[PDB]
């Protein structure tokens with residue numbers, strides 16, 4: 001199975017070639033078609049599996065590149081992962097003109113540029129959400145990257161608050177290496193008939 005076999009088109013395929021990705025990882029082969037098809041996905045995988053591209057590639061391909069406003073919001077537990085994911089998203093979109101990524105963990109002028117992808121930690125995202133500097137009215141895709149870690153670090157209240165402010169019509173991808181009950185409950189509250197992927 002190739003990346004083109006998963007339904008990815010030339011701009012993303014070219015970025016993958018620039019990055020030296022030769023073939024999809026298992027989590028990518030399983031998750032990418034579901035997300036391209038507009039499903040919610042519960043992905044059980046950890047760093048090293050390729051989970052970042054698994055959620056990033058399909059949601060990038062699915063956005064409106066001419067809409068200069070946040071369409072993909074990615075929640076991460078740490079400044080380090082937020083920055084890493086934003087860098088990856090920037091690399092995957094290298095051949096998508098006018099598509100821009102912001103990491104929030106300087107922040108004001110980031111959001112004023114109308115980035116289509118915003119990656120951040122829950123506390124800092126929730127600050128800009130309350131301030132109105134973060135517009136989620138046009139959001140199409142929500143990712144929780146390491147939901148179990150956000151729970152464990154004490155951030156789940158803020159995660160829930162963010163998730164309850166998102167407009168009805170959106171895709172959700174939730175990635176978690178483990179499955180605490182509180183994450184099961186988040187899946188039931190906030191996701192629509194999710195495809196569960198554990199290999």
Ligand SMILES: Nc1ncnc2c1ncn2[C@@H]1O[C@H](COP(=O)(O)O)[C@@H](O)[C@H]1O
Pocket residue numbers: 020021022023024025028046047048049050051052053
């Ligand atoms: N399909 C792939 N082929 C080669 N390297 C990859 C692939 N997908 C992800 N990677 C790399 O694998 C590492 C783990 O990614 P992640 O699991 O998303 O943190 C990162 O260094 C990625 O650049």
